Every structure is written in structure tokens, then in C-alpha cells.
């Protein structure tokens, strides 16, 4: 049978889990709900019909007819073969396994079109925006670190701890008393305009909704077909058959009518119920997530809201604007970014000491001015909060490979079981 | 059966998704529409006939005949075998599965010829042009960066921020007060003549249209055959058979005529409809994209239109000129180029401040002349817009591997299901 | 059946597409036409007979005979078995599938002998000649670049742009006012004598024509056999059979003669036509390309015709001289050489300015003598045309691996489909 | 059947084509003729019998007997089974497929013994001798290059071109006026004694001839068996059978004698002819190459005959001396050595200028003494013939891997085709 072989052909497509050697390429390229819907909606029909093909062979088993005892073995076989072909439309039982394949094939194209067209475009855009996110994070603390030697009040910490300027940090260059201050006028980063660039020119969102709506209508078309077939299969499966057509029209030995019955509709009726109940439960899941302002209402960029110099999240939520789609992909792809975890702890220092009036930008100089005028001892405070927030993401920014979609193995289903007797 | 094994043999050819380790080798080598047309036009006939071969075995099932009860089991079997061979031309039903294979094989050669001949040639040409695209981008800003130390009006920014000249950028060499200006007379780049080089000598475009037109005519040849077969199968499938030829010509026990019927035309008739409706819908898609001035009317090189020094897009659109073909391949292969994303944000600064009169070439010196005469503070403005547009593409320009066309795995279809009873 | 398993065994041999990690190892080792001829001439017979073996089982299906009704089931089976063995020569129908295998096996040896013997020899020769081609290209411009500091007339460009001599190019050594001139007497390169070395000693060309002519004669031998078989199968397929030999010679119950018929010649006759029409169309393709002075009349080395110092293409075209064969391999293997693309643009500057009198050897000094006597500004013109033609091929000249002929995968055909009933 | 599964088991052994990552490991380890003989002599019997096993099943098909009509279905089946076992020796037809397997297995051991024992020993010996071949080549020119600064007559070329001594060659050390001359007394290289070391102690040649002669005698043993079987199968295949042995000896209902016939000898007779004609054609090929002084009479070391200082090929050709065997392996393994191609052009300069009196050792000083006394200009002649013959083989002399014998893939034959009906 052909039923359970596209099963493994699809099992190697939604199980990517790419072993991303580079710094960050764990790009899902589709939402989690999309994978769950596609696998269930397509795979489940293949599993059910695979059971059916295990017994719907030996066409003489599909239909049987009653014949007079005077007939021979071959004459009785002719009647069964004749009525199977020379057949309320009862031919729907004949093509029932064929139809369920057509639904599965038509339910697999919309995922394929997205993979061929909209997948490479969304891969580079997310990679570029997350590439430059850590650059802003690194420069912000480095500018604060470069401003360290300007606000010394404790001891003689203008310049000290000098066997090497950055002996734990870096073995190059040396430092001395500061004479420069950071005055910046270019406050807007690259990401600020990139958000506005994607705020118009709706060309990738249309490829998303169009693929989704094509899948939705196919589900309804399959749902009504199962209901129509279920009603038809619940009426009867027996009919009278006459083979007196041709030279046998004037035969006085062949009986006028024969009794025949299809004995495969019992299994088919059960299969239609399972598909029907699953589809009517899958439809609300698809419908509930059609709306753009669905779950994940909370903002994702609020971590960098006040970090370098500027403000973030000055925009609302809307519909057809090519936005709120990259935000969805960012949430499922923010798992591997070292800036996010580092910023995930700053907001939690809002307890006593850094409470109702937090700034969290130059907090290093907050507790180096009220101490003793005599005695520097700066080596502990001046580094324990400097390389603990920069060295983590300063490793491996050059690797770029492993973009193939799940080469994997043939470990999935293969060829059914029974081959004997 | 042989039906559903070229299915996996072709499934490993249009699913490349090469894991390109090098800087940029994600070369599709064919358009997205070509892959969709080839897979549907070739794969779908194989899927349909694979269902058919699951039951068209045991030749006694293919045809049946009515015989007198006085015949034995072997004598009745002789009649069925005789009329199956000794057969309106009714032999078209016998060779119907054979013909559909011939269409699939003939529909696979034009893709194969393009792969063997025109694939390696188009691989190097696109790689070379995109290799030199980033070189022009890097030198343009570097020349602007090298011209930084000439237009200082703020403070004493002629030379400053000197623990190291390019401590974030590069640890080599040092800088001082500028005395050289960039005077260029060789304005034409290499890409300018390469476009004109491909503007004539039409030798790769002919290999594209010739392969496409061969596929188109085969589709029409298959379309008319299905219509002719559908009309024939709708007339009748029964005939009279006589075996009295030879020593049996003067036999007084064998009846003169027998009634026979082919019982496989019912399934075959349904299969012809599915192929017919799909092909008549696939034909407009192929025809609509035959014209060279199809979709993607907008220019792709307009991003570099005024970037280094010159102007781009001084040419119109035409037909047989070996042009407008590399442009199509560039659009599907511009996904992985760091110059494109960097230039994709310059045009969006057209708001207030950089509006009706934009230049976007030396905008760094626009806002360093009206500030205070006293106080340099140049470290912020002089670097935050320099390594943010150059370091991105300065990583990994040496790797070159992974040009194999989808080694992949055997995860596709394999050997059907049923083997018992 | 054995028909459709050498199909995958050969599918892994002509689909190399080696993922050449090294600088250039994309060596085809055979012409494109050779692959197309071998795959079609060998594969197509296997595909056709694979259909035939799907039904030519159960030897009682191969032949059938008419027996008296008084015979039992076993007695009737004896007659069919007897006449199948105890058989115009009608045994050609028995061995028809066997013969077509013999043609396929004999049509596969000539490719195998070339692979074992002439493949490694041609691999190193093409690799060596293309290795030294870029060396001549690099030294030519470098000599021109080394001669830059001798012909200065503009400004004071004798020596300038000196924070580092080759800061974009190379971080080593320094330059000053030139005092040496390039006087060369050894004008002949290594490639000049290598062409003459291969101009005699015809030992690899004989291994090419001998393999080709063996394939050609086998095609004609198969072509006549199909025509002879087609005529034989069009006469009759019925004969009389007598089993009265031995102790049954004096048996009064066994009828003297029986009527038998072979019912597999109908499918075999169709298969012979398909092979015949394909072979008579493949023969002109092979014949048309037998001549050495076939397509690719234009020279390939005309790009380097005047580049370093000398002239190229001082030779005509001839036959048995071991030449004009490496030229064919060079054309299909000139795809990956950085010297070719670089030289492909020089000839197109033949427009106004560099028209009827082009030299294109030291054109850098053409436009540095008529400018202003005061003001050097040499940094733009002296480098923008120097590293743009040398750095491209100065990367990765050490890698050498991936010479295996298509390890690939088992993604091709495997084991047919039907296994039940 | 077991016939066509050692076919793929052997297809992965003679198709090595190792992807040798190291500098040179493309070691064939066996001659080309040995691979062709082994594959044809062993593979071809497996292909032929694989056709035979597609129909020699259902033992009732192997033999058939005529029985009285009064017998039942089971009684008639007993007669066929009895005479098949209770059987001119006619049992040779029963064991014919078994025997052809025994020939194939016995024809595969001699290749296996050579692989296990004599393969690793011959791998290191050829690797070592070719490792030291390039060392002699490199030192010869380097000594000539080191002697360059001693024979200057043109200009003031005693020392010149000194921004760096070997700026294109190597960035280390510097050169000046020469004061040392190359006086050598140790003229014998390591390879000179290694040739004499292998000139005696015949221990690897015996493992070669012994394996070859075992294969030769097996071919003759198979050849006579086919001729004996062909004569036997051409006499008759029918015999009388009596089952009256035991309690049936005094049975008055069982007929005394039965007529039986083997119907598989027709296919077997054809198979014997194909094996016979192939073997009698393969025997002269093996015999013609038994002689040690066969083809490849010309010397291979004549390229280095006068290169460094000494003379080569002072020895004749003989038989059992453990020599003339490494020479055969050298010819098939001289494909990948950079010294060979470099020396392949020196002998072709024998035209005018370097004709009847060639030396080709210090030809660099031939054309630097008759030029002008004033003006050095040495930079062109002193390097263009120095790094063009040394840098080629100065890359990658450390890699050592990929010695496995064709890991490959399962792309070969697998499991036959037909599984239904």
C-alpha cells in the first residue's frame, strides 16, 4: 500500500532540531502551533488508512455474491468480478481510500510553498537583527567601563591595579588617568530604523495568511465529505446484480438476479468517525490563532527599554502592517542570545537600595564615593562586575553552517510488517 | 511495481537545502516555480499509478470470461488467458499504466540536461559577482573613514582618542593629522563591464528556453492522450471472444463465442480525470511565466545606485539579450549578502533632517561642525557608525565547500506497504 | 527480478557532482554527451524490462494449452509443463528477457574500463595545468605593479601613501623610489612546452576511441536483433504439441495433439519497438560527435593570448595527434578558475578610449601623465586596480581532498513495489 | 535466493577510489587487469544464476510426471515428490545451481588472502619510496639556486633585488655575495640502496604468483565441468519412475511405471554456454600477463636519470628477483607525484639551442654571461625559473589518513525485484 510511506517522508520535515554549530542558528522558521497542526492534520489520515490497506486486498474479499450451486468455481468468480465493476451512488465505497490520500496531498502543499519561498527570506532577517543586538549590549557596558576612571572619590583609585591594565580581560594596551568624557549625539541605533523598515511594505505577511487560509478551507471540505459519507454508509450495503447483458441476455440457465454485499464498509465507517471528531477539534485551534493579537501580548524588547540611552516600545499593536510577525518569531528564537539572560537580572534588583528610583546604567559609581578617603583597594569592585557581563558573548562570532532542514536518518516508519501467508 | 520508486529518486533532487558552510553558497540554481512545476508534473502521475498497481495483479483479475459449466478448472482458465492476449482498439487498456510511465520519464529529462550542463556554469558566475559586491561596499565606507581626519571643526578633533588608533577596530598601525585627499579617476568598477559582458553572447539563455519548451509540448501531448482515452473508456468494456483457431476449428464441444469483460477500466477512468484536471491547471502557470518581463519588475541594484560614486540602472528591459536572467537568479540569491541588509536602511532616513535633499555619502561630517569650538569628545561619534557597518562582513571569506546536490538520506518513500495474504 | 537493481547501481556512477572542498577539483572526467548516452543506452532497457518481469511469473501463465475434460488437474498441468520445455524458432520468446540483460551488461563495460585506467591519468594532468595557469596571471600584474614606481609624471607620486607600503594588501616590507626595471629573456612559460609534450605520444587518445567504438558496434548488434525479433513475433504464437514420447507412445487415452499458445509475446512486441525507436535516434548523436573537429571550434586560450608577454594559438586543428582532447576537457573544466573571469572583461574595454589600438598590458600608466604637475593624490588610482585583480585567487591554495566518485546515498530505486496477493 | 547478494558484497571491494585526503595515498594496491579479471570471473556467474533462481522454485515445477486419471490430487503429488528424490547420472541437474556457487566462492579466496597479508606491506613500501623522491628533487634545484650567486657576469648581479632576499619565496633570512661552493662526495641517495635491497629476498613475489596460479587452475576446473555438463544435458531429460518399493510392492492398483521429465534443463543448458564462452576468452588474458616481462617495457625512472648528480637504469630485466614488481606498482601510482610532471618537460627542450649537447642541470647560468656588462636587471631571470619548480610540491606534507578500503554505501544491488503473486 501507499498509505504509510509519506508518513516517514513527512516525519523528516517537522523534526528539524538542527545541531547549530554557529553562535546562533537555532531558527525554528515556523511557530510551534504550525508544526503541531500540520503533523496531526496530515499524519493522522495516513495512520488510519494504513490499517485499512492491511486487509482491503484480494478484491474477491471486497465484495461477495450468492450464486446457484450448479455454477462452477470460475463461473461464480465471474459474477463477483462483474458486479464489482458493473456497479444511491455505491461507488463512493470503492474510492474511499483514494479520496483520503487526496486530502493528505492537498494538505501538504501549503507547508511546501512556505518552505521554498518564505523560509530563506525570514532566515537572514532574524539572523541580522539578533547579530546586532549583542553589539549594542557590549558597547553600552564598555562605554560605562571606559567612563570608570572619571568618577573616583575613594582613596587614590584614579589609576591603580597596574601590573597590566586588563590582565584578566585583555593583554593589550595600558590605561592611565582619564581625560575624555562620552558625549553622544547619534542616539538612534540601526535596529530603530529596521523596525520602521518592516513596519510597511507588506510582502511577507501575505505569504503567511494566504498559506494558512488555503489549509483552513481544505479542512472544512474534508469535514463535510466525511459527514456525507457517514450518512451514506449508514443506510445499506447490499444490492441486486444482473449480468444478462450481451450474448447472455437470452440465456435460460443464468438466473435473472444475484444478491451481493460489500463487507468493507464496516471498517470504513469507523475510520470516518475518527477523522471527523479530530478535525472538528482541530478547527477551533486554527481559528483561535488566526487573530494577529493572540497570545504573547507582553512585549519582548522591554529588557533593552532603557539600557544604552534610548526608550523602546513606543508603538501599539495593529493588524496588516507587516509587524507583530517578527515579534512572534523573536519570542521562539530569543532562547539563544546572551544579551537576554544578562539583562534578565537587572530588573530584579528593584528591592531595597535600588527601589522606587532605579537607573541601572552607571550603578558602579553609586558605592565608591562614600567610603574612606584613605585606602584605594579598587581591584575587587572594578572588575567583578565588568568581565562578568561581557566575556560571555565574546566567544565564537565567526562560525556559520548547518542550515540544512533535518538531514537526519531513516529511523522513522518503513514498509509495514506482515509479509507471510 | 515500478511506479513509486522514482518517487524517492526524484525526492532527493528538488529538496537540496544545501548546508552551505562557506560564506555564501546558498545558490538555488533554479527558480522556485521551476521546482514546483517539475515536482507536481512528474511526481503526481507516479502517486496515482502507485495506487493502481496495488490491485492490477493476478492477470485473471484483469479480465474474466463466462464459460459453460461442463468445462474444467484448467479449460476455463485457458479461455481467460487466450482472450487476454488474442485481443475500437481495446489494447489501450492493457498498456495504460505503461504509457503514464513514459510521460513521467520524458518529463524528467529536461531538468536532467540543465543540471548536467547549465548548472556548473551558473554557479561560478553568481558566486563571482556576489564576491566582488561586498568589496565595493567595504572600500566606500573605508574611503569615507579614511577621509574623517580632514573635515574637523568641533574642538580639537584633528587627532584624538589615541591609546591606539583603532583599538576596537584593529590593533595595527597608528593615525595622525590627515594630509591626503581622495581624488579618483577610475570610477567604473569591475561589475559595470561584467553587466555589459553578459548583455550579449546569448549562449546560456538558449539552454533555458529550449529545456522549458520541451517540457511544455510534452504536457500538451499527455493532455490530449488523456482526453482520447477518457472518451474511449466511456463507451464499453465488453466484447465477444472466439478461441476456435487451429485444431479447435472443427471442434463440436467448444462453444462458438464467449462473453468477456475488462474490470480494471473503472479505476483507470478515474485516474485519467485527476491527471487531466491537474494538467489543464498547471499549463497556465507555465505559460504565464514564459515571458521574460514577468513578475520582479522592480530593480534589485537600486540599493547601490549612488553608494560609492556612480549611478546604476541606466538600462531598460528587453527580450533575447542574455540579460534579465541573472537578475532573476540574483533576487532568489540576494538573501545571503551582508551588503544588502546594510544598504536596506539608508533609504529610510528620508524623514525630517535628511529629507528632500539627501546625499547619504559623507553624512558623518554633517553634524560635527556646528557644535562647540571648545571640547573635542570625538570618541562616540567617530566609531559608533564605523565598525557598525564594516565588521559584519569582515568574517569568514575563505571557506569554500558543500556544493553537492542533496546527499541527504533515504527518508523518502520506500517499497510500498502490503506483503501478506 | 534482476532487471531494476543495476538501475540504482548505475545511478550512483554518473551523478557524481563531487563536493570539491579543494580550490579546484570539479573535474568531470568525462564529457556531458558521454554521460547522457551511457545513461540512456543502458538505463532505458532496464526500465522497460522491469515492467515485463512484474507479470512474467507463474510459468503456467507464460504458456497455456487446451486439454480434454476427462483429464484431472495434475494431468492438465503436466501438458503445459511438457510443452513449455519440449519446444520457426519459438525459443526466442523464452530467452527474450535474458538477451536484453546481456546487452545492458556489455554496454556497461566500456565506461568501466575508462574509469579504472584513463580516469586517474587525466585527473592529475588537468589539475597541474590549471594549477600553473593562475601563477602566470598573478606574476604578470605583480610585475606591472612592481613597475608602478618608474613612470610617475603626476605630482610627486614617486613615493607616497606611506603609513604602510601595502596596508590594504600586505603588512610586510616597505617601498621607496624605484631603481630597477623588468628585463626578461625567459619568455617561454612551462605551459608552452607542456602543450608540445602532449602534441605527440598518442597513448591516452587510443583508450578513448577504442572504448567509444566498442559501444557503437554493440548498439548496431542490438538494433538488428530487435528488428529480427519484431518480424518473428509478428507471424504467429500458436503451435501444436504432442507428448507421446516414451511409455506414452502406445497410450490409447492421450490425444495425439494439443493446442498451445504463448500469451507473453504481445507485451514483448511492444517493448522491442520502444528500444528500436530510441536506438535509431541515439545512433546519429554518437556518430555526429565521433569527429574530433566537432563543436567547440572556438579557441579557449585566446583570453591569455597577449597577457604576460607572448602569443597563444599558433597551431591549427588536426586528428590523431593526442591534442584537441585536453581542449575539450578544459572547456568543461574552465568553470572554476579565477584567472578566466578576470581576463573575461579586458577584451570588452575595446570601446572609445581603448579602441582600434589596444594594448591592455600597462594601461595603469596611460592616465597618470597628462594631469596636473602639482598635487599627487595617488592613493585612489594606484590600488583600486591592483588588489581587485589579485586578491581573488590568493585564498586557499593548499586543500586537496574529495576525489571519490559519488559516495552519495541509496536514494535511488530499490526493490520494486508489490509484495501482496 | 542466495545468488545475487555476494554481488553487492563484492561490488564494494573492487570499487575503492579512495578519497585520499593526504598528499599522496591514491595507492591502487592491485593492477588494473587484476580487478577486471576478478570482477568478471566472479561476478558474471552470480548474474547468470540470479536469473535462474527467479523461476526454479515450487519443486513441483522442477519435475512433472504423468499419472492415471483415477489418482487423486494428493496421490499425484506423491509421485512427483517421490521421483524427485528417488532418482547416466541425472542428479547433476539437481545440484547445478549449487556447483556454480562453489566456483564463485573458491574464486574469491585468492583476492582475500592478498588483501589480508600482502596489502599492508606493499602500502608502506610504495609510500616511503615516493616520499623521498620529492626530497631529492627539491634539494637538486635548491643546490643550484644556492649556487646562483657564484657565476655572475652580467652587470652587478653579485647581489641585488634586496628589499628582502626571498620576498616572493620566503620571508626569513637574507643573502649576500657568495663565498661557498657545493662539493659533494656522498653521491649515492637512499633510493639507490633501497632498489638493491628489494633486488633479493623474494618473499612478496611468491605471495603474488601463488595467489594467481590458484585462480588459474580453478578456471580450468570450471571450464571442463561446463563442457561435461553441456554434453550430458544434450542427450535426454526423461526417465521412467517406479514407486513400488515397500508396502506398495504388492499393490494391484498402482501402475508399474510412470513417465517423468525435468523441465529446467533447457534454461541450464543456455547458462552453461555463456559461462563457457566467457571463460575460454578470459583464459588467454590471464595467460598473456603471466610473464613478468610483459607490457610496460619502457623504464619509469629515466626522468631522474641525470637530474641530481648520478645515473639511473644500470640494470636489466629478469624473472624471480623480487624486482619488476614494484616497477609495475610505481607506474599505476606515479599519477600523483609533483616531481614527475616537473621533470616531464625538461627532455622536450631538446630543440635548437639545447639540442645535440644538452646538460639541463645548471642551464640558468647559460644565458647570463653574454649580455651587457652595464646594467644588472636580474630580478626577472633569477626567480621566474626558481619558485616555478619548487613551490608546487612544498604544500601539505603532513596529512595521513583515509586508508580504509571503500567504506562507500549500499548503492549496489539489493534483494531482487518481484514479491507479489
Numbering used by the authors:
A (entry chain D), B (entry chain E), C (entry chain F), D (entry chain G): 2 to 88, 101 to 434
What does the paper say about this structure?
To further elucidate the function of PANX1, we propose the full-length human Pannexin1 (hPANX1) model through cryo-electron microscopy (cryo-EM) and molecular dynamics (MD) simulation studies, establishing hPANX1 as a homo-heptamer and revealing that both the N-termini and C-termini protrude deeply into the channel pore funnel. However, despite the confirmed presence of the full-length hPANX1 protein in the cryo sample, the electron densities accounting for the intracellular link (160–194) between TM2 and TM3 and the C-termini were subjected to local density falloff without local scaling and sharpening. We tentatively proposed the final structure as the hPANX1-MD model, which was generated based on the LocScale map and cMDFF-RSR modeling. In the resultant full-length hPANX1-MD model, the permeation pathway of the hPANX1 channel consists of an intracellular channel entrance, a pore funnel, and an extracellular cavity. The heptameric C-termini protrude deeply into the pore funnel and occupy the innermost layer. In particular, E414(422) and S424(432) formed major constrictions in the channel at the intra-cellular and extra-cellular ends respectively; the intracellular constriction was abruptly enlarged at N412(420) through a turn at G413(421). Thus, our current hPANX1 model is in a closed state.
Pannexin1 (PANX1) is a large-pore ATP efflux channel with a broad distribution, which allows the exchange of molecules and ions smaller than 1 kDa between the cytoplasm and extracellular space.
